Amino acid sequence: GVQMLLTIVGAFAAFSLMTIAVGTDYWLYSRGVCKTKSVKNEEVMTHSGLWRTCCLEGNFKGLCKQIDHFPTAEYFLRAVRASSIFPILSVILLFMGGLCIAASEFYKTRHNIILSAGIFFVSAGLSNIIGIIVYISANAGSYSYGWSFYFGALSFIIAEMVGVLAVHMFIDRHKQLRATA
Amino acid sequence: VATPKGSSLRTPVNLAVLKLSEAGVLDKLKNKWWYDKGECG
Numbered sequence A: 001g002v003q004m005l006l007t008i009v010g011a012f013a014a015f016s017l018m019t020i021a022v023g024t025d026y027w028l029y030s031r032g033v034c035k036t037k038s039v040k041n042e043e044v045m046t047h048s049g050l051w052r053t054c055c056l057e058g059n060f061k062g063l064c065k066q067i068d069h070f071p072t073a074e075y076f077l078r079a080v081r082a083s084s085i086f087p088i089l090s091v092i093l094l095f096m097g098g099l100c101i102a103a104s105e106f107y108k109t110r111h112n113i114i115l116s117a118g119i120f121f122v123s124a125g126l127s128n129i130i131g132i133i134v135y136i137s138a139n140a141g142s143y144s145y146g147w148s149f150y151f152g153a154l155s156f157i158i159a160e161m162v163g164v165l166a167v168h169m170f171i172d173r174h175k176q177l178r179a180t181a
Numbered sequence B: 001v002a003t004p005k006g007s008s009l010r011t012p013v014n015l016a017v018l019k020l021s022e023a024g025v026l027d028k029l030k031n032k033w034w035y036d037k038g039e040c041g
Helices: A002-023 A073-083 A085-103 A112-140 A147-179 B010-022 B025-036
Strands: A028-032 A044-048 A052-055 A064-066
Touching (some): A002 A085, A002 A112, A002 A147, A073 A085, A073 A112, A085 A112, A112 A147, B010 B025
Antiparallel strands (some): A028 A044
16 A cells, blocks of 8 residues: 555656656756857857757857767667667656556556566666666766756666565565465 | 068068067967867867
8 A cells, every 4th residue: 555655656756757857958067069050169068968958158058959979889879879769768668667557556456567567667777777878988989967867867766666666566465365375 | 571681671570570479469360360260179
């Protein structure tokens, strides 16, 4: 009862946090530009996310551009980093975990719909680590990570905690069946 | 800057160049063409 309530709340939190990270732009406070060619540049602080980059300060404060991820083993990294498959697949897996948790609230007989939720959450956390590493690794080849990056990192923790909690619930269901039979 | 020998412009030109160094007009043009109108940043 109370354990399922924590799981529901934690599931939503991690999903929400991760969806707010993949959607925002405050990932990396870098030092670049925001505009393109014209008939010199303005290197000012630019809070740059995954898809867009607005110049925090400077004459063009708030102009977001489209990060150009393509300026053997390096092409593959760029493609993964450019499509943010991992940061986007964690959000797809966390959402599927919520459906599994919700499905297990209307079909109590099926105990295998709770284990699925746990695996989804746990796998979502693992997919958010490759995203972090891919991000940092690709971004490499002075900065300061922002709140958007920390929501992605914080999502993992919340998701991993929901993952263990769901596994515990699965085991608890089966323990009840092994005591009444 | 160069001038034919015996010219009357040797001294006015020589002083003009010095007058443009203290004022920083020789470094402003160098920055204008080497860096301001540059491409590598």
